[PDB]
Symmetry: C4
């Protein structure tokens, strides 16, 4: 794999792909963390959208955002997704890094906006952030992040279009509904454990803005867990040897 | 941009497009505000569809209505959507205004019907209306409306079919599921703040029928916020320069 | 319109269409009423699927069942749907009546099965049945049934395939997801008022099995309301003059 | 029907199909049982994803997993599905057995992982397992499993692609969204009765790991019920005589 290929010299398109990932991740953090704080601050019992509503915010926004950006950037919104695809040689190292930076920056900005709008409840109720919950240890958290991210990245590889690519690149277009649903599902199982990270930029953006020592102590789990889950899904996709032209037929 | 083009002289189709927008918005207000009052009036704790159920009423009805009217009017159901498309020169000024009037009228009628059916609970529990909630200021509300409407209008532009148009027009057909989901998502984040407007006709219809001074004082936020969010999504779509024939591939 | 056409002399297919409607409606009543009783009997507060869960049972089962039977019968599962299509001359009188009978019979059987499985809770918690709730009058109930059924039947007409028909007939195939979603939405608004009928066979099956005088007194609303809502959606579809080959493009 | 056909001598593909079923079922058990324990352990009232959230975990994971594995194995994830298809002669005896073993093994492993991560709550709150709930008898449970599995398997047969098959086989590709929705629906009606089995490998995996005598006493219902429901859906599909090339047109 070279550091970069000719696609990365199509500078206009490559710039707009980075912007599309930046904005999408910003929007992803804003809606989901605002949903979280809005639920956490509610004084009436059953007065909120509930944990079910939070899981929907994360799954539904990934559906919407991959839908909007798949033809522009490939629709990653998530460094572990970008990392998996890079391992499968679907993304160059240079594009991979640019994507991760755009995603981490967008994440900080989105969470930033939630804090700007509701600083009181934002600081009071945990800042959106991922950390190990009471009654679990780090090994369980990490395990839950690995397997959770595997589900996500396994779904991404199955969702790739073998013939269609994002504008001026060979980065595969992705079917958004299955990927959104994978996210929703993993939140249902993983919210009691870590909040659910499965997305290093999502975890990072919230840790940057909330800036607590507890959250920073746990932060490595939300990089290492998803990167490992991503690598194991790539390995698996490579072994069920189904890159080729296994187009999954949508629902 | 001329005030109107030859499509607007196809009077039969242009009339039926206006009617389709009028009826759709009426149905949109009736189902969603009835869902709201039905939840608000419930005496049993967890005896209702909950805030999650309300968010679904708004997102799901937009999915259903854009599905039914996309081939007829372009499926706007929302003056900020019409406004964004007008800025992108996808709609003439004359069609734009006719649409907004049909949507505002339909909105009043739909809320009217909710009040006719359940006047007691209708007046008691807030009339469906949008206003700034306790503990937020006008700047937060406006900000939340801007960004919320941006998410919606960004999704609309990505959902446009570059080849297919509504009957006897060049108004693009829209993919309904992504747009419905955008609405659902924005409600999850924005219900604790304003009720969620992101739709001037939705906010106006409820303010007309509920007719409280508090709600009228706040009403400008629900026009200005969505119009700004819409204009920034148009600007953005124009800059990721993706009008051309970026057909987003559905889920 | 003749009483019948040559499609009705294709006896093998016509018989299997009737069977498909009978079974589908039976399955529709069994799952949805079982969901209702299961929620109603639950002793823990928030220990159930909630009203949101009930609305999903009705909307999701119609999605699933129209999906399974659309190519076989046209996927009606509902006499008001059959009635609307008959008014639009898409179904003959003979097929229409056979469908309504199969649907009413299947309905009784499905509710029958719920009672057989959980007779105690079945009788205690209202039998699944539709009736006017406390605090509303008959005119509101009827109005809510008219408009609710209009939403449903308006969606059906938009969901019709202008080129594809059920086996050995000219009965249009229907797009199931939009129709399922219409049902879900109308339940969100209408459950506090009548239970939501919008389906005479659904209301009839539950009234037959539950057999209370109160429920029988209200039963006419659940025939008259949906038949009127259906006729007004047909009239409307005929006037937005969009039978022709307005194929709504799916999501 | 011969014991096996030439497809089963394509050893590379046949091995990878078995692996795909093994992994998918493992992931199915892990996410859904983790969702169950996470809800069951929650100390705050309405502090969880609720029974609605659990029903979504089961329906949504089947949607995601059939989406990922349909082109690889046919996407069964469930011995009653495999059994139904075998009866319809769509799967050979040899492939059928290999699938059931891979599914049962994967199931044990997935539940195993949930216990490894949260052994305390895992043992305290029922291990994910299926059993007859208080206030119902075995005949009701069995009946509920039969009819529940019928809904599932009826949907599977309607979801089969008559032209497209899994890699190097004639096992039909399946439309995942309808099947996922069938699962979701049956959970809504059946959770108060048995937990919902409709999947012998799902019931077996949880019974193996939880290892209680009560759960083992009831276990036969979760094999016999779904196998019967599956056989009756096959019989029905054979009689509505719609194997041929009834392609259900997706939503």
């Amino acid at each position: 794999a070279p550091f970069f290929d000719l696609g990365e010299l199509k500078l206009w398109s490559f710039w707009r792909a980075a912007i599309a990932e930046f904005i999408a991740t910003l929007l992803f953090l804003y809606i989901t963390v605002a949903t979280v704080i809005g639920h956490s601050k509610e004084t009436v019992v059953c007065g909120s959208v509930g944990l079910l509503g939070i899981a929907w915010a994360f799954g539904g926004m990934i559906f919407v955002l991959v839908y909007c950006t798949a033809g522009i950037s490939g629709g990653h919104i998530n460094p572990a997704v970008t990392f998996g695809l890079f391992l499968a040689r679907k993304v160059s190292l240079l594009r991979a890094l640019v994507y991760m930076i755009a995603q981490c920056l967008g994440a900080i900005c989105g969470v930033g906006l939630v804090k700007a709008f509701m600083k009181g409840p934002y600081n009071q109720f945990g800042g959106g952030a991922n950390s190990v919950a009471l009654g679990y240890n780090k090994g369980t958290a990490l395990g839950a992040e690995i397997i959770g991210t595997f589900v996500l990245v396994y779904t991404v590889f199955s969702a790739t279009d073998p013939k269609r690519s994002a504008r001026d690149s060979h980065v595969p277009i992705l079917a958004p509904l299955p990927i959104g649903f994978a996210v929703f599902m993993v939140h249902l199982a993983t919210i009691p454990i870590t909040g659910t990270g499965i997305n290093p930029a999502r975890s990072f953006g919230a840790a940057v803005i909330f800036n607590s020592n507890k959250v920073w102590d746990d932060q490595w789990i939300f990089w290492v867990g998803p990167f490992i889950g991503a690598a194991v899904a790539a390995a698996y996709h490579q072994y069920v040897l189904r890159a080729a032209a296994i187009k999954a037929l949508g629902s």
